[PDB]
């Protein structure tokens, strides 16, 4: 995976998101904080139970951001496991 299509595939997602909300920079920060939050609720040595986090939450937070604008949501969903149908 030196530079698989998936790599540029991901970059395109983040890029488009940036160029999309050029007027609303605050949006960019949030999205990144979402994926970032995931990482936070992972470390801390042993994964002791305490309402952690995973892909499910990230999907919600990002969805909350891109409300109505499910266009970008579709891209994010591609990475996440497809639900029913």
């Amino acid at each position: 995976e030196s530079d698989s299509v998936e790599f540029n595939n991901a970059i395109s997602y983040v890029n488009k998101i940036k160029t999309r909300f050029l007027d609303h920079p605050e949006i960019y920060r949030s999205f990144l904080e979402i994926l970032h939050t995931y990482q936070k609720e992972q470390l801390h040595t042993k994964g002791r139970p305490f309402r952690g986090m995973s892909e499910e939450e990230v999907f919600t937070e990002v969805a909350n951001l891109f409300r109505g604008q499910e266009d970008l949501l579709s891209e994010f969903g591609q990475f996440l496991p497809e639900a029913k149908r």
């Binding site: 998936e6 790599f7 595939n9 991901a10 970059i11 997602y13 983040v14 890029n15 940036k18 990144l32 994926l35 970032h36 995931y38 990482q39 892909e55 990230v58 994010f76 990475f79 996440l80």
Partner: peptide
């Protein structure tokens, strides 16, 4: 999959 997106942000930034 998240690794690519999360990492992607750093690339552009």
């Amino acid at each position: 999959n998240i690794q690519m997106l999360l990492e992607a942000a750093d690339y552009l930034e």
